[model samples]
Every structure is written in structure tokens, then in C-alpha cells.
Target: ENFVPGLDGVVAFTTEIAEPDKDGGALRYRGVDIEDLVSQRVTFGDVWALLVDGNFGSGLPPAEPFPLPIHSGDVRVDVQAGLAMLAPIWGYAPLLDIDDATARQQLARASVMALSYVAQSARGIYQPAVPQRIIDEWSTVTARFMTRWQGEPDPRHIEAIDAYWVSAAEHGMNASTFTARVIASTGADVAAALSGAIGAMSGPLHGGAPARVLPMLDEVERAGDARSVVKGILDRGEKLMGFGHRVYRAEDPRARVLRAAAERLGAPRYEVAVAVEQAALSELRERRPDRAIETNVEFWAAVVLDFARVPANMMPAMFTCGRTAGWCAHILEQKRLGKLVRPSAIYVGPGPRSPESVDGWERVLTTA
Candidate 1:
């Protein structure tokens, strides 16, 4: 096996589930372009159902009224109680012997469970109405439910949520999706697989950068100087967290859609982010002329999500809430193959020596 960093450019497994053609300028799920799907005005549930079942659910499925901890009028206490209430069910559940479509419904189930947990625990008195009426529509109803959780949704905010949901629905073999596929390949239950994937999604590299963008922007806002603030970070050789991605040579298509939507959605941070972006790019161009460190999805993802009134800390969780559906879709694909996904590693550490051999020289088995 040839050596590659982090399995770079390695075709570790075959996937018919989704492919991100960054060079080709498209992110496709099950062979359909994301742009094509979003233009159809699909709901997140619709996208998840489409990805899983290859069609929409028959009418709207009724929400299972989630049980949350009632408030003693202290928001923080009540929210913590809700998380405590949700803990018991986060474990493995009996998946029984379900086919692909039923497995697909579990996609919605997992996300609904997350939404219930998050929406309920967040500070607010208006109990988010027992999940969405019809399987988590990204409409006013679902928005209202979420807003009530976060303390009331505005039109612009929900619009951002809607756009972000579709764009975030899936990306090919991302960290969490890859994690999910690994578990599914081992023939684990759906809950177990989904949990592993969601676990991977919350990390700093995966979903962390977007939430971090807000504070970066805030720093620029406080400094009142985008150029120097960015130049200082660059001079110190610190990362501009939201500026680049490994996959795209140009602007991330998802970022382009979102930057436009930051304006389209009328994000409060729109001007601040744009100013910072311009300054960052100019400074980055001057600082690192040889490399193309263009804007990535996380850059504007923060702005739009912030516009949607999603707390900065909650953006990653919010992403997990929707992307869980995509992970389930991948899980469905992986389990149907029913093959163990073991891969071999190329050893580069100190070379092993045979203990049984009568050696001509003492083998230096050095440990650092």
C-alpha cells in the first residue's frame, strides 16, 4: 500500500450514497445535484426521506409528543433538566429486522430526537409543540417551534435555517458520515451507528470552525480594524479558521450560496462578516501569495446561522440535528453491503524486529 497523509486520495471504500465533486462544482446525493434538489423547495425531512426511501413520505407523519422537563421558571435549570430527561433514551434501541425504507424512517427519528433534546433544553418558556406537526418541516411551524425554544423565530432567521438545512443535508464521506459508514459496515444497530457519526461531527475540525467564526468576527468588530486584526493573526501564523477548505481549489460552492444568502437573509452580521472577509482575503493574499486560501462554507455558515438566531454554541448541534438524516442515508447504503470495513495501515514507526532470530547486530527497538 502506498503512503498518504490521513489516507489522502485513498479510495478506502466504494460509495453509491453521495459524492462531493468539488472540482466539478457540485455536491450530489445519490446521483442528484444538491442544487437540483434545493430548487424543488424540499424540506429537510423531504431531503432525508428522499435520500433514504428514494421519495417523499406519504403525507405528513404525526410527531411523537416529546416529553421535556417542565420549568420552575428558571430557564437554565429547566433546560438542564430537559437534557437530563433526554439522556436515558440516547442509548441503543432495538432496531428489529427492518428493511431499507424503515431504516430510512429512523433517519427522521434520530434527528427528531436530537431536535427534541435541543429545542426543549434551550432557554425559553414556550414549550416547543410536540415536534413538528408533519415530520419536521422547515416551514413556519417548525420555525415557530424552534423559535419558541430559542425565544421566538423571525422570518429572516427561519429563511436562513431553511437554506442552511438543505445545503447542510449531506456532503460526501465527511467525518461524521465516514464514522457512520464505518459503524454500519460492522453491522451495528442504527442508533449505535448514528451516535458514532454525531460524535464525530461535533469536533473542532468538523463542525467547530463555523461556531468559532462568530467570535472571530466579534474580535474584528471590537478591534474596529479588520486589516490589522487579520494581519496580526496572519503575522503570528495563526489560522484564519473560516477561510479555507481542503476539498475546494476555489470558493466552496456551498459558501457561495451561503454568502449570498447572508445578504439574502439579511443577517445582522452580514456587513461585519463581509468586511472581515474582504480584509482577511487581502491580508491572506499578501501574506501567503503562493497558495489559494479562499473562503469556505464555514465562513458564511456562521453569519447565516447567527442570523437565524441560532446561538453560536448551538450551531454544531444544529448541524448535527439535520446532518443526522444524511448519516442515516449513508448507514442504509453501508449495511446493505454487509461487509466489514477493515482497512490496513502502512507502518512508518520504528521497524519491527524478530525476537526469535539469532541476530548479527542488536536491534535498536527505541521507544520515545
Candidate 2:
């Protein structure tokens, strides 16, 4: 076998895999169409089960034994009590204490601040006072963040954030998701798998890209010409970040769901951001005649998160919060398959040769 330098575009795994063109952009898990799944009955948990078991008919099996004896009720009560005790200290209490109106205002302002901080911090190019733990769990950490910083998160804003999270939950194996699956194939535990996936997502092209769109919109606002901005970006040989996807060439189904969620949440600048994205897409097509760019998930996701007043820094955290369900599902799926996911590799190197003849070094053999 010949060795390959990079595993570019290799098909390492599959679940009802098909050629992209043949599928007509339809991706399904266990026969449930993703577009329909996104629009209707499926919650994030459904998707998680689909990824793991290739179907959603049965919910996650109970982690413990079912048909608990009458005596088991006490044990369950104690467990619930323990979890409840930890909840306040964990982060929920601080968030509950905040003034609703002020927290909402801070959400809008802090989003930009948080996004900028995460983008720079991930690159190892800048340092901010962001808590290391918060950086890791931005959504939940920051759920109560404003409260901790200013002594409480607004209740109304918390409701909005919860709604945003439900919508943000899962999509199929997005770029960073693929990265996670690849790492998990090597037998890493869930934490290690998720860590690698999160690292990949932290890069500008993945999770960080959505937040950057706000700044791009700002540029369009300053230039007073969306068309020229789109053209200028393309003319300079740069790819617009949020306009397209490898899987959804026609449209991102997730975008529509989030757009609706944004409307329900009454997100600020929701209309304006949508207009900017639309104008930019039109301009991109006009400037680059050969490219077929459509709205991908990130475009609307940015708008939704921005609208919900989630701090931008916490956007990726939001992404992870939604995605963690999918990760756990995939991990469970891999375990269920119970196959050692070892793929064959082709090695190319020098054959056995006389050591002295090849490098003037003598080879010695030792016997135990």
C-alpha cells in the first residue's frame, strides 16, 4: 500500500452515507429526514439518539436499573436532594438575583465583549480576565456571569437564553463535530473527545466565525454599501464566513429554526442583521458568478444569539452546550457498536538494510 501524506476527504465512517449529489442534499439518520427533523418533532435529544442508535424510537435507556423496588424511592429522593443542594452554589442562584432589565441590557453589551475575548483568547494571542472555567463553560458560566459581575441576571433574559439554547442544540457532524468523531475513534474518553472537539470549534472557521459576522455587519454599516463590501471581500480572495456550507448547498435547515426562535425572543437587531446577511448574499453571487453560496446555520445563529442578548464570548459556549448532547450520543453509539475503530494505514519507509552500510553505524543484537 502507498502512504498518503494527508487523509484529505477520506470516508472513514458512515451512517446511511451517500454521495452528496445523489442525496439531493437530503441527510437522514435512521430514515428521519434532517430537514423535517429540524423543523418538527425532533428535539436535540432525538438527534442525539439518532446519532447513537441510528433511530429515535426509544429514548435514552435509563442509566440505572428500571422497575425500581418500592424501597428505591428513597434513594431517588436523596439523589435529587443532593443535586438540588449543589444547584445554588453551582451558578443558578447568582443569575436569579439579577435585575431583569439590567441583565438584558448587559446581555447585548456583554455579547460583543465576550465574543471578542473568546476569539482572541483561543488564539493564545491575548489575555483577558475571563475565568478559565467560564471560558470552558461560557453559556452556563455566563448564564450567571452578569449576575456575578453585577450581582444578578435578569429573569426575563434567562428565559430567553433557555429558549435560545434549545434551538441551538444539535446539527449533524458539522466540521468541528467531525473533528470530535475522528478523535473519539481513537478510544479517548468523553471528556478528551469533547475537549478536542471544542478546541476545533474554538478556531475562527468554526464556532468563532459566527461572532465575527457582527463585526462584518458593522463594516457594512460603516461603508454604507453591502454590495461593495461583499464584492471587496471576494475580490481580495477571501471567503465570506457565514454564507455557505459543505452539507447544505441549498440552505441550512437549522437557520430557519433559529430565525423563528430569534423572532419569538424578540431579539434586538434581528431584522437588521437578516437584511445585512441577505444583501451580502446577493452581492456575493453577483460578484462571484460561479459560486453558489446560500445561508448556512451560523448566519442566523449569530443573529439569534445576538438577539437573545447572550454575550458574544459565550456563543461558542452556547454552541457547546447544544452540541454536548450530540457528543454524548455519538460516544454512546461508538460504545454500542463495540468495534475497535482501527483503520488500516499504509507505511512508506526504507526497507531493512545493513545499518553500517546505510549510515556508518553498527547494529547490535541483544538476547534476553
Q: Write the per-residue lDDT of candidate 1 for residues 6-54, one digit (tens) a residue.
A: 8677776776667778677777777777666655545565667666756
Best by TM-score: 1
Model 1 is weakest, by summed lDDT over 10 consecutive residues, at 74-83
lDDT of 1: 0.66
Native-structure RMSD, model 1: 6.8
Which portions of model 1 show Cα errors greater than 4 Å? Answer: 1-7, 36-41, 56-62, 68-96, 124-148, 219-225, 232-238, 344-368
- Candidate 2 per-residue lDDT, tens place, 270-338, comes to 666666677777776776668777777777778766665556665666665455545544544443444
lDDT of each: 0.66, 0.50
lDDT of 2 at 233: 83
Candidate 2, residue 215: how far the Cα is off, in Å: 1.1
Q: Model 1 Cα displacement at 95 (Å)? A: 5.8
Worst 10 residues of 2 by lDDT: 61-70
